[PDB]
Amino acid sequence: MKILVINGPNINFLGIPLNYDDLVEMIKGTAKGLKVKVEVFQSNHEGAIIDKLQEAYYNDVDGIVINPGAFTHYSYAVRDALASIAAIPKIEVHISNVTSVTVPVCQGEVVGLGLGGYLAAMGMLVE
Amino acid sequence: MKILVINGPNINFLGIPLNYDDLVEMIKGTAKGLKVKVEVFQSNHEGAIIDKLQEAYYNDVDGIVINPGAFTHYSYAVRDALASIAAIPKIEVHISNVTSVTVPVCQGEVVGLGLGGYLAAMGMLVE
Amino acid sequence: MKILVINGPNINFLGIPLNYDDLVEMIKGTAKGLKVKVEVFQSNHEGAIIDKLQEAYYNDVDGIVINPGAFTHYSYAVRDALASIAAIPKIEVHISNVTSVTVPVCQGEVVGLGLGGYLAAMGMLVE
Amino acid sequence: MKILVINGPNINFLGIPLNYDDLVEMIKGTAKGLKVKVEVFQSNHEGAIIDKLQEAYYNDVDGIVINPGAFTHYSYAVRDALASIAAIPKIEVHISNVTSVTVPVCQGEVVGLGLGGYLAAMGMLVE
Amino acid sequence: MKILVINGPNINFLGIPLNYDDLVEMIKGTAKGLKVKVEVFQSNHEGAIIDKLQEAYYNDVDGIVINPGAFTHYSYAVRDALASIAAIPKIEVHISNVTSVTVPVCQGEVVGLGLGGYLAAMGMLVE
Amino acid sequence: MKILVINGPNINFLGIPLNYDDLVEMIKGTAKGLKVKVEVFQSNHEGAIIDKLQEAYYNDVDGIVINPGAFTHYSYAVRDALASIAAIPKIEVHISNVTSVTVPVCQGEVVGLGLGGYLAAMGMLVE
Numbered sequence A, B, C, D, E, F: 001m002k003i004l005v006i007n008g009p010n011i012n013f014l015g016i017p018l019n020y021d022d023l024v025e026m027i028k029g030t031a032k033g034l035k036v037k038v039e040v041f042q043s044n045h046e047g048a049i050i051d052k053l054q055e056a057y058y059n060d061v062d063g064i065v066i067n068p069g070a071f072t073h074y075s076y077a078v079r080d081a082l083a084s085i086a087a088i089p090k091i092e093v094h095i096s097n098v099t100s101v102t103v104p105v106c107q108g109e110v111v112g113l114g115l116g117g118y119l120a121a122m123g124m125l126v127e
Helices: A020-033 A046-058 A069-073 A076-084 A114-126 B020-033 B046-057 B069-073 B076-084 B114-126 C020-033 C046-058 C069-073 C076-084 C114-126 D020-033 D046-058 D069-073 D076-083 D114-126 E020-033 E046-058 E069-073 E076-083 E114-126 F020-033 F046-058 F069-073 F076-083 F116-126
Strands: A002-007 A037-042 A063-067 A090-094 A108-111 B002-007 B037-042 B063-067 B090-094 B108-111 C002-007 C037-042 C063-067 C090-094 C108-111 D002-007 D037-042 D063-067 D090-094 D108-111 E002-007 E037-042 E063-067 E090-094 E108-111 F002-007 F037-042 F063-067 F090-094 F108-111
Touching: A002 A046, A002 A114, A020 A037, A020 A114, A020 D020, A020 D114, A046 A076, A046 B046, A046 E046, A063 A114, A069 E076, A076 B069, A090 A114, A108 A114, A114 D020, A114 D114, B002 B046, B002 B114, B020 B037, B020 B114, B020 C020, B020 C114, B046 B076, B046 E046, B063 B114, B076 E069, B090 B114, B108 B114, B114 C020, B114 C114, C002 C046, C002 C114, C020 C037, C020 C114, C046 C076, C063 C114, C090 C114, C108 C114, D002 D046, D002 D114, D020 D037, D020 D114, D046 D076, D063 D114, D090 D114, D108 D114, E002 E046, E002 E114, E020 E037, E020 E114, E020 F020, E020 F116, E046 E076, E063 E114, E090 E114, E108 E114, E114 F020, E114 F116, F002 F046, F002 F116, F020 F037, F020 F116, F046 F076, F063 F116, F090 F116, F108 F116
Parallel strands: A002 A037, A002 A063, A063 A090, A090 A108, B002 B037, B002 B063, B063 B090, B090 B108, C002 C037, C002 C063, C063 C090, C090 C108, D002 D037, D002 D063, D063 D090, D090 D108, E002 E037, E002 E063, E063 E090, E090 E108, F002 F037, F002 F063, F063 F090, F090 F108
Antiparallel strands: none
């Protein structure tokens, strides 16, 4: 099984005590534990996220974990990108207790569980 | 006469039975029929569309056909880019029967006529 | 694919700056672009239009584009002629922003797009 | 860091397609990924859970994950056992979307995330 | 003292009689007068602005002047980028007399003073 | 281009941490930046301000920046002096967030921007 994790704008500035590299290592260590392959991606560009989602359709990704950051509350382009790949299961993640445009085009949401929310989302895709 | 056709985010995933390459062939074939030159462009980046609109002003484009996709419903930056080039006539196009921020800064809109909407828009710029 | 274009009374007096021969050249050029065969016909006689619609049924026309002119608002004979050939898809076209008796027996209407309305109608029959 | 996972009555009958041994392997694999030691325990006896909670106090467990099953809705004895060890952080977990007596004596609850809820709870204790 | 000036989308099309190169020369001349070092940046990409703000945090910039253009009215990503660097003082600028999402995360706003608004904003950071 | 800056009563006691000599150096440095000649004048006498405004008319000053201090709230003589030289553009400046008699006989007011308000006013006279 192959999983793709997508982080939106500003997420790389976690810790600015756990930082973004701590979250990446927790995700990569959990992937070995669950016996899955994982790719982790972050960008500040809305278009680079849409390109990464379109690349996932051509690369047989088995499921997607996404944290859009602030794009959750205004990016109808990322909503419609997630709607264009409806064959792939996706879970939306929020680190803090953040109405949203990307939720109804996803198979579930995890909110307010801190850095543990990604680990639930990966578990929900293995189930 | 030189026409520029601009496609917004997600439009390259048409048919994911007619697809995006079928639409490009229909536009390029119709340009020869109308005896005009055409450039067709697509990007998932909001800033690449604004760069392409600014490039058109320095390149003596005679008219613009634009399908913003989802940016129609939230991109005040693309609205104000179209407002900055008021000397050039533009037609907005929607493939499906989709309130919009980009409409009042254009000379017309074509809506819900499928892939035929681009062919009306090219005709309306020749007239 | 074979297309038939029918123009009603008075349409030959367009431009009495684009005239009727400009419209015929736009249609014939666009047909090569879309890789289709096209016949363009005009008459001032209501009965010659009904004869042309009956001829089309015996000639394996794949789709019809029609602009009835003023007959749109009173010719129940042309309505019932279009109803008699229900196996063939037809699009109704109006050049200017014109209740209509011929619309409910057609697969769609295109209105107020100038001479561009024929090009959308040909696109909608290829789709 | 040392974690203790406690499962209540009936939890060993999961899958009577994922079963209880699948959940134990997911937890043990995730523990290696997070670089923590884990003990996983299940019993049908209310008193054996209270003995295990009392043993944890003498064994320097750094955090507890607990799924009481039905005891959530009536066991004031397990509530008061969790209250007696207030120096140790605990997270409560429910597999399905199950008022509760054990919740207010814990640092958090995770509900309805399936077998993924344990993985969030371990993350929330590492954070 | 080191100052960073950020211009958003469309600002490079000022005067399409003073233009964007006049504004850059006024800012660079004023910086020598105030005895400060200045960097002036412009982009049409929302993500390139967020990258430039994140780069400023690693480069010990003493204060920021920002004119977001249209992003002022919808970019919650640029708002949250400005919030992520709260150690650095920022002034927001609007050339024309433009409710705004980026204002409450800045230490002041200058509005409707034309190209003079940048000179006040530099003064307010030297003070 | 020649600019005249007039400061009213009490302005020489700024900082009784930036003082009046700091403000004069900021103005003289900004004048070199904008490529303009500047004269800076201060007096506690209402009549010496009126003499300086009458001198400006005979010396072809291209624009005036004025901070009247408290004379803003009662000096109809300085108001009518500014009205007597309607051929010269003037900007009124207030350092702190101070109804006024001198405002309607000026081309604009700048208020509450600290010592930055003078630099905006010089920018507005070059524009």
